[PDB]
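ligand=magnesium ion
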Amino acid sequence: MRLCDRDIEAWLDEGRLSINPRPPVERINGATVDVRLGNKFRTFRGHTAAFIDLLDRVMSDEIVLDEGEAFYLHPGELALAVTLESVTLPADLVGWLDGRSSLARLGLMVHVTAHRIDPGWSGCIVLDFYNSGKLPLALRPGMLIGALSFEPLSGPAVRPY
Amino acid sequence: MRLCDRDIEAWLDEGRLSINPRPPVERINGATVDVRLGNKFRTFRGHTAAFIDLSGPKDEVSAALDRVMSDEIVLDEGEAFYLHPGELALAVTLESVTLPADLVGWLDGRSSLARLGLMVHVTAHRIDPGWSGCIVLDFYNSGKLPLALRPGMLIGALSFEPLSGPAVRPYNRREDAKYRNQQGAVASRIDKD
Amino acid sequence: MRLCDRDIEAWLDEGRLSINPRPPVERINGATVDVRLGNKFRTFRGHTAAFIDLSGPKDEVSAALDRVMSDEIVLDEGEAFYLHPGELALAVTLESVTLPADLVGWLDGRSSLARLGLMVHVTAHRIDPGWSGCIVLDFYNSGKLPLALRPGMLIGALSFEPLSGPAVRPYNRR
Amino acid sequence: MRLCDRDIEAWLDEGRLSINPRPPVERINGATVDVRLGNKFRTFRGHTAAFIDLSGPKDEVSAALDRVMSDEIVLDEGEAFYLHPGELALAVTLESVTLPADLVGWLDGRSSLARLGLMVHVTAHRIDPGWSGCIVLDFYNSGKLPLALRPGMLIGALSFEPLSGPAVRPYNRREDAKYRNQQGAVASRIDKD
Amino acid sequence: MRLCDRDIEAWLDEGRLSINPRPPVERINGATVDVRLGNKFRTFRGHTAAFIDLSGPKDEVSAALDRVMSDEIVLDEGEAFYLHPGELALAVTLESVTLPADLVGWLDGRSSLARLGLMVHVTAHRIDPGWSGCIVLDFYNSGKLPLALRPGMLIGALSFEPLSGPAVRPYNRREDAKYRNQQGAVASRIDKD
Amino acid sequence: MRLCDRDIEAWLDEGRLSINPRPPVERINGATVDVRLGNKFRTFRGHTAAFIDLSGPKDEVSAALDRVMSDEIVLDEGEAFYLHPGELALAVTLESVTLPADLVGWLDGRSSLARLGLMVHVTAHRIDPGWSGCIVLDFYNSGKLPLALRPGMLIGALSFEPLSGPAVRPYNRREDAKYRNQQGAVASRIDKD
Ligand SMILES: O=c1ccn([C@H]2C[C@H](O)[C@@H](COP(=O)(O)OP(=O)(O)OP(=O)(O)O)O2)c(=O)[nH]1
Ligand SMILES: O=c1ccn([C@H]2C[C@H](O)[C@@H](COP(=O)(O)OP(=O)(O)OP(=O)(O)O)O2)c(=O)[nH]1
Ligand SMILES: O=c1ccn([C@H]2C[C@H](O)[C@@H](COP(=O)(O)OP(=O)(O)OP(=O)(O)O)O2)c(=O)[nH]1
Ligand SMILES: O=c1ccn([C@H]2C[C@H](O)[C@@H](COP(=O)(O)OP(=O)(O)OP(=O)(O)O)O2)c(=O)[nH]1
Ligand SMILES: O=c1ccn([C@H]2C[C@H](O)[C@@H](COP(=O)(O)OP(=O)(O)OP(=O)(O)O)O2)c(=O)[nH]1
Ligand SMILES: O=c1ccn([C@H]2C[C@H](O)[C@@H](COP(=O)(O)OP(=O)(O)OP(=O)(O)O)O2)c(=O)[nH]1
Ligand SMILES: [Mg+2]
Ligand SMILES: [Mg+2]
Ligand SMILES: [Mg+2]
Ligand SMILES: [Mg+2]
Ligand SMILES: [Mg+2]
Ligand SMILES: [Mg+2]
């Protein structure tokens, strides 16, 4: 059971849920809220290590782009990024990050199987971008990148985030 | 709450939800309806552009997209589409799906295909309330072998979830919705953003 | 409606939902249970075939998959499985899961691992009502570094959704 | 012994060796002649076949090759071919080269291109005694960035080695030679083996 | 100076150079002898190790090599080895070659195979004076399609270059030479450095 | 004709050819001198640019190259550079080489490294008459495993070939030569074309 657009907006009014900045009415529709891309990226530098045992001589310094700059996501490359919006969920809501079909049709994955936003989460969401396509994708802060949907839990989470 | 098999049948009978052609009972079980592969495909031509500027000027984006997308591939009967490792291709479900304003659908792949590397979507798997049409698939082969895909094969599964109420802005009424009544392997319309 | 953590423990206590071995409460938070990695693996050997025809049942499974798979790789502890970028490997969860006819399950990854490119499924992530057993994992490394994986590590997260009613053709019947 | 720049000029003056159009003095130095990129290309269409059986039955091989090779791509002036990382493409030199029976030629790339990942051949770089024609290039981009290739750019270098004597079976006289008088981006003729 | 066809035959007749089995006149032309593919192969098993420390402690390097190399694959008659894009595999020439102290040899691929992406070596293509044995090939498919390789196919070419004099330390006399009298698809012996 | 080990030693004694530091006798055999890996490296930063326009406007090319090339990496003693499959990196030989106007040099890899997928060049492997300096290596790992590279390891081999006479336009006298007296892991200077 997902919250329809009208109940998403009612939870935003009520302060049960908060998304800041708040997307316009045009970006809240069906069972989803459209979310945009922020301005902090990282990439991986493999020459420093042979492997990781499942930490961070391998990550770049945070990359913040100048106005009018794009991050170029090349095919076969994983990059970390953030949502522009901060999201705060109550103890009885779980959220689910999904991509956009327009971007999937060019090969952009906006996550890599972890896509659950936990009850009690508060913060911008970290994105793991992967370009499975043939062409480099120029990514710019502020672009629509995904969508979030919200599922109420059976009851309130005892151990929320 | 997802609809169990029995309730999917009841929504289909009531005409709330439609899937055309309607799958037989054998294809509806648990909490999912199996869907089949259509016969329209599209590939990418990288040599004609350096990149795609996703949120660039509409006319530039549009011209880049038209350069990189192949024409639609239609397979005869007996023909396979060979999906090579590392290649992304667009395909389409045989079935058209129509959802009412108070239901959302979700596309998943099949474990039998996944174990060979076949991804049937690339993180966009939601079918919106008010959707009507064939579903475009973005296949990616993450395995070690080419996979021969044939029209009519079972390619994924759809599940359905009731919304908390009817959507106020369902897909069929949204003025800026890009993919209303989509029929073949439709390329990205990111230029309409 | 996902089951929340307290409601996950209830269902386990009832005994229709079961995970064997039973995870400690430390592993059950919010609306998910963390699951662990088993010690059975499979890789592919490309050199014995040109392709696989996915239009099928069972003729592939066998005459295909069986012929392009490794024998089963069982690791002694102290040993790692090295998952190299761009390689797909088959693994299995440590725990066996049994679902009743009125519940569907869903395997997700862990954000901590996904940030390094670990994909724990490849679009098929639904555990059906009536399902009984260890879950097969299809791992894929989308990152830039090999990842060492060790039997027993926390590898993913399961969440659970009640069905609208009990399924009529559940996995054990079908 | 390779011919030094002075001797390459003497062989060209004597008409022993020909390169058409003849490069200017600025392109002939040390032990090499710099060559330029032509404007014909070819790519591969993988989705039409599972594999190529190199020493299989001639008619099956031939049909597979005709399926997988694109039509010839001809670039206008102003146009680039975009060579993406991991992609193999065929191209052709601007120059036609004719060798006598007592000389062998060798194609190399340029360090400036190599340091970006551009390979101009794939382990076949010998130009046989008796050869006459344009040279087909198999480009592979082993780097991290797409490379815009434009007709007319400097793409590699040829050097030349006298043989111990004139070849008895030079290329122009061999009945089973596959590539005599080649002109565009000619695809593999492995089916003629 | 490379030996022309006629002089290759003269060196073979004189027993200065040997190639066993001796290729027929049809395979010796211009400045080269065509060589054929043997029936022994080796692949790599990545899952057993994180990396190879090339100049590490000998025992650690040796243990890593033994873990990553497959057992020798021997093809029956009729059987193909399928070389998929992006895969490196070891193979061997059908012919054994023996060089005297005053000759060096050079392995090239074939343009017909190169045009499909097949590299027959990975920047090591010298056959040393005093060499005796079958030649190990490191195949890499840089193309878009799997290639079916069959024993006995023509895979490459050898040319031969006189040295300025006889080598004082030819391969057959060097104590630390690793690959003397190699016969199957011998894996790297970098651990002997 | 390549110089045999004995003549390489004579050319070095005569000061015709220089290699600094001079390799010991154990590293000079057959027709080659073994060379060793230096301790400077450079990688690529793809996220800063969409592509490189090889024969575009000089200032655009120059700005793109400055964006995509890393700063020089210098490894301490004990440190390895990890070269992952599919990655291209720039490195340098430990040795500086100086060639006279009548000699050309040729860089090859090692069979031991090739059997693990290490390419030490990307089709540009000529050292010109009049060259003086350390040689930049473009490493590519075509194998399945990361390779740990350490400064000082044996990485390849140089051979030498007399020219038909002294070059009139050797590298040290060419005004437009791009890489005279190169010392570290120098990036492509394709912008100087
Ligand atoms: O794999 C998919 C996923 C979705 N759809 C359809 C159903 C869905 O209702 C519609 C829009 O999906 P989404 O909102 O992801 O796409 P968008 O790129 O945001 O398009 P829009 O601008 O119309 O929302 O596309 C497909 O054809 N294939
Ligand atoms: O794409 C994602 C996915 C998740 N998260 C956040 C929201 C979620 O509530 C939290 C934890 O996710 P998960 O439980 O998957 O991470 P973990 O690896 O288990 O770490 P933890 O120990 O924090 O539970 O990470 C993101 O920011 N981006
Ligand atoms: O990553 C997964 C996903 C699913 N399953 C199990 C649970 C699920 O209930 C069953 C069947 O899944 P699915 O319907 O995706 O498989 P299929 O390929 O359609 O096979 P079947 O014909 O058995 O339904 O497989 C796994 O072991 N691993
Ligand atoms: O792997 C190599 C190959 C060459 N060189 C040096 C020696 C050679 O003499 C010089 C120039 O080589 P080339 O002519 O192939 O490079 P270019 O791009 O043509 O530059 P230029 O215009 O200076 O000739 O660079 C290297 O350092 N590394
Ligand atoms: O990069 C190259 C290499 C060679 N050739 C031409 C010149 C050479 O003289 C001829 C044949 O080369 P090769 O003998 O390597 O080709 P093959 O596949 O063996 O063909 P054939 O049966 O004609 O010898 O092809 C090219 O056009 N491009
Ligand atoms: O593709 C090849 C190239 C060479 N060789 C043989 C012939 C050559 O004379 C010998 C040694 O080659 P190289 O010197 O390149 O190998 P190494 O790694 O340096 O070994 P060594 O320490 O024996 O010199 O290996 C092959 O079998 N296959
Ligand atoms: Mg949308
Ligand atoms: Mg199923
Ligand atoms: Mg967690
Ligand atoms: Mg040059
Ligand atoms: Mg030939
Ligand atoms: Mg050696």
